Subunit: 352 residues, 4 copies
């Protein structure tokens, strides 16, 4: 078995490993369509999550089941499935507490290319098949399905953590594929006015498409300044962080009004700390809640977004700005993700 | 002043009353647009809410402020306003409890055509104008605006009470204009699949429009069986009740899965008790939460729903199937509500 | 293997079965201390859950692990453990929804004496040891610890479903063991005034001890009237149903104010429906929420209550009014639970 | 009329002014008991809230209503009442969003010794008596009562924001009187283990008195370290911040497990930004929600905490380490708070 992988911090390059074996509960999947993510770029070229050695990358993929363990009951070989970037061990205390995202340690729920071989290989392992895989409906295009395992789920969580109220006006700081899914999320939580913050033109279109009502380019003056202007000093009810500097937090705290919420689904790679503006936080008494969590995973989080897509509640295909054929183009795609061209949102490498 | 009032249970007509006078915190408004409600019919032809004598009916209207108390600070004569069906007294313990709908007593938030002359008059009084009036953007048409005060706020509340999760599948029992807004609200909360129940063609047609993905007619047999079959025995995540007799409650509990919620916004005008089936409620342990509350009123509520219409997140105008002109047509619209003709959803009477 | 079982509705006796065997993830436990429950009385002499054939009763026990599967990592034979009345299979869709109590179906998390042989056997089975067993601290006596599996977790769930707020006055309807634990629960959630309803002197004294501040006897007039008098027409903030007829639901809805909660933990064994007062439930808009749930189970649930007993926040021992020695007394005790003598709260049988 | 006031930053002293007059909805009150608050120290000798000119200090008091506006309905002269440190204008939109503390502006709900003349005067003004005053039962001692307005509501609020679950282990950072009430608060929320951080002997016994089970002296090592050891690498479920430097935020996050909550009620006076460890906050995906808000005020808040004290759910009197007689000592009492003696938790001044 061959596959892309992080050799060492900053060092990438294909390698060779064993076709993994399915435990009695696990399943082995063969990639049907995959995509790269800024998350890999961070942990690889910045050691946000320490160093690793020859660890196949990629967490986003849909594909078919090659073989299942004796105990697997809802998946046969040859079934098409959506594999969540999050595949936690479902029998730990974190789960009983209500946090599979951290089943077995902080962020432990996130296994692929973090603490396990990723989806960028002729085959990949999936722990607890019946709990971590989802049947992919034929009606849903491949390039669209691959947006669910990590873009949709992460973005939507953004909208979930924000406690959006019907008609509330929301601000989405950063409009990359995740930030964009947050704009869709907010629309879905019944947000009224959505203020998206970003410059890449193609993103600005997407944002408007997924629901953005007001675009705010962070090159026409400070962001806090421009928003307080649009909202007339009132501010925003909720603000979701989906990209930017560690100081983006300071910006969000200032634009949300008191009793508002700062929902963060962004992954901070560098910096030893994140700052909170003492004054705008009411010296700690302004009632502005700060949230930040790893996106939900598991079969359910996937069955549900499927429905969202199936019942045309959302169309993630608009995030796919580049479609590459055949395995080989993984490296191309990966790098294409490194130095983000200016016409890019999300690239998808079909395999079969 | 002339007004269409309830004369005595089972009798209605136009009467003569003094033009109301504003207290320092009130405002006197003239109707630009009003609409009749199933509610008034219940309190006039069912005596569901005790009796009344010469109580001007109606509680759905957009108007123009005519005069204001000495303490009103945000509304002047000439201001076009969206008037909430619920005009609570904002200085009570209920308010401090987070239940303004019950400020002063069970359902006391609802004053118009309850314990205070309604809007079906040349002029009508609004208490605490600054807290209970919202400025109506010119962009939004009268017939759409007159949907916010009651239809939209109620419908959406069923949605809110359902605690709908992203992608969940909800059932909306009863698709009158309220049921219709519940569907809309369901879609607004990220609902995936939406099973709408009702038979009137105009409703089934509007339901599909607002987001219903499945139609179930209670005339082809028991709702519970049809819904259980539509869901392959899985049942629905949430059920919003917006119609039917008392036995609709049982039906709700039976179609919702353990841990789901039955959200009620329907006005049960007849009967002594509502029945909850034991076995299907898990003999009291099915974790099937039952909710039932009055629609939210007040300024903020109205502003937010206005934003929904303004930012095209919803277009209530599709609920209007009959529009008449002039004061004399109030009585016609009203009767058009007593005897529900097949092509009706909601009628609006334009006054200028 | 010998064990006390339900032969069929209205029939209970001693039977014989094989010492069960443990799959790779289970453990076999021998009873150290067990107690009977009112829940079994219903299912048997009322067939409230339908027919049952030759099923060992009981589901409240603390015992010693006798053997474990090749996969049980946290429990060796000889380990003293508190076994939860609810032992769900932690790998299902319900668990991913936050309702392990209905893992695999409504009430399916409750296996012992429901759809699996109970704890009144020489030995009994426990599915998923690392997920369904909790180590018993030596500092906690058997007679007290066995109050944790069902009584403490149920009464507390009442308090949990009630959404109690600091200083709020709660009403507990029914002060049996569960009710008594609900009173403790209310107190543990910061309840101010607590009105307990019952009549058994032994129970009343017990309520005062766990936090009751007022005692209403349902043999001195209707509950509603008495409680409306103690609260001066204001009513209570929440009512936790913990016993009574089917009509108890209506009492609850009448005594709680608008926006309050009716939290049921009682398990109704008779009747087709449970009545809901149309008017006192504000015709469906009084915002009076109704909840009913099966007590939490699993390991974490037990560890948390263990802790409450350990750090002395609660002492269940007062529930135990009868203690007996000998495996043959499981019956004496069971029958004791059948025809409730005036001086009995809870009976416990010590086997070793 | 005399009053102890802040003449400017660093300059305190007595002043004379015109006895305030009530608007038709307000009430004038004379203090029966008052108490200095560390908060006032921060705003005087630190200007943590900019500067003020000749503003009577103090905001914690219980007095007797001397007179009321023609609209006040529930309060009369002679009526002994508790006065919440927070008295908002209940007719704002912040109120409609559910955040009275920020009615009309961030923290604008807190008027006394902030943007309004405080309670250290022979008389003071209380706006909107019917919404901002609660009767004081004869049975509650004055020194106990004067604790409710600020210490109790704030400490409890910390515990409320903490989202504490039954049997959870909570950590209280800073056992000042607030922290002391946070502890009782966590005890009231049904917490099991409670780790209290502090070193003042007198506060340590108060902490053990209100429910602490573990004491952590910031002398035997780093807070972060001792708590980890105490929780055997597991960490705490919730962290309630009631003291420390800006860095204390970092400690907190560091000790709460993923998916836990950091609740702050501590008023920071120095610093520009509060630090959040990028790593321990799981790079922002740890799900460690952070909350911080100005304590609740108003009548209900006071009524609820009053019932708590009355029903003996908390005895705040143990916070009162210093009692002073005569209106004149108010100044000494204040100073006693500037230079924190080692045997003081909370000083009180009884006038009559
Ligand atoms: N750990 C996980 O499992 C996981 C999963 C999902 C997501 N995530 C996190 O979520 C992020 C998703 O973002 P993405 O990859 O789609 O795109 P990205 O490149 O990470 O973010 C792009 C967005 O941020 C804006 N931006 C850049 N610098 C900014 C600044 N200083 N202030 C404000 N906005 C700024 C961009 O503007 P332009 O348009 O001008 O470029 C664009 O709108 C991930 O990279 C990762 O951090 C983590
Ligand atoms: N109290 C207030 O102030 C207030 C204010 C606003 C709203 N509301 C609430 O909103 C509603 C107002 O009425 P509305 O506009 O919703 O229209 P409606 O005409 O009252 O109800 C229509 C819906 O009920 C259906 N229906 C009738 N019988 C049924 C049955 N046996 N089983 C299932 N569905 C059945 C209708 O189907 P067909 O098409 O076949 O008839 C339609 O789906 C009330 O429930 C009221 O409580 C109350
Ligand atoms: N399925 C499960 O796993 C599970 C687990 C735990 C609990 N439960 C349920 O919870 C209950 C457990 O037993 P328990 O502690 O509640 O003791 P109980 O003996 O079942 O109930 C005793 C209480 O009900 C009162 N009562 C009886 N009729 C009443 C009426 N008409 N109005 C008001 N109160 C009335 C009793 O009054 P007296 O003082 O005169 O008796 C006492 O206050 C059962 O109903 C059981 O089904 C189920
Ligand atoms: N604005 C408002 O309405 C409002 C209301 C309520 C509370 N608050 C804020 O909360 C504060 C708490 O009340 P308080 O003033 O009575 O007490 P305090 O003096 O603010 O705090 C005392 C506590 O902090 C600990 N402490 C001091 N330095 C520390 C450090 N470096 N690291 C860790 N712990 C440290 C103390 O330890 P020792 O035992 O060693 O002294 C003690 O446990 C209020 O004064 C105010 O700032 C504001
Ligand atoms: Zn990723
Ligand atoms: Zn209506
Ligand atoms: Zn039981
Ligand atoms: Zn203070």
């Amino acid at each position: 078995m061959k596959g892309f992988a992080m050799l060492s911090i900053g060092k990438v390059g294909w390698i060779e490993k064993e076709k993994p074996a399915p435990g009695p509960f696990d399943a082995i999947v063969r990639p049907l369509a995959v995509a790269p993510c800024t998350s890999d770029i961070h942990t690889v070229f910045e050691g946000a999550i320490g160093e690793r050695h020859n660890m196949i990358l990629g967490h986003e993929a849909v594909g078919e089941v090659v073989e299942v363990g004796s105990e697997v009951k809802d998946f046969k070989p040859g079934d098409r499935v959506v594999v969540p970037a999050i595949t936690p061990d479902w029998r730990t205390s974190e789960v009983q507490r209500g946090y599979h995202q951290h089943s077995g340690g902080m962020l432990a729920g996130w296994k692929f290319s973090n603490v396990k071989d990723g989806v960028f290989g002729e085959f990949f392992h999936v722990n607890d098949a019946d709990m971590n895989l989802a049947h992919l409906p034929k009606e849903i295009p491949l390039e669209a399905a691959v947006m669910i395992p990590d873009m949709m789920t992460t973005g939507f969580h953004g909208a979930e953590l924000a406690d959006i109220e019907l008609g509330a006006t929301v601000a989405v700081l950063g409009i990359g594929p995740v930030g964009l899914m947050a704009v869709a999320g907010a629309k879905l939580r019944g947000a009224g006015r959505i203020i998206a913050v970003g410059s890449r033109p193609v993103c600005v279109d997407a944002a408007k498409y997924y629901g953005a009502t007001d675009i705010v380019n962070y090159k026409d003056g400070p962001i806090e300044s421009q928003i307080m202007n649009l909202t007339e000093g009132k501010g925003v009810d909720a603000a979701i962080i989906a990209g930017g500097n560690a100081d983006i937090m300071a910006t969000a705290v200032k634009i949300v009004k008191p009793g508002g919420t700062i929902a963060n689904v962004n992954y901070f790679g560098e910096g030893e700390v994140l700052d909170v503006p003492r004054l705008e936080w009411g010296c700690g008494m302004a009632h502005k809640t700060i949230k930040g969590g790893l996106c939900p995973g598991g079969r359910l989080r996937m069955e549900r977004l499927i429905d969202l897509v199936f019942y045309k509640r959302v169309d993630p295909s608009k995030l796919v700005t580049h479609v590459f054929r055949g395995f080989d183009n993984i490296e191309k795609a990966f790098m294409l993700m490194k130095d983000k061209p200016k016409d890019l949102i999300k690239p998808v490498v079909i395999l079969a």
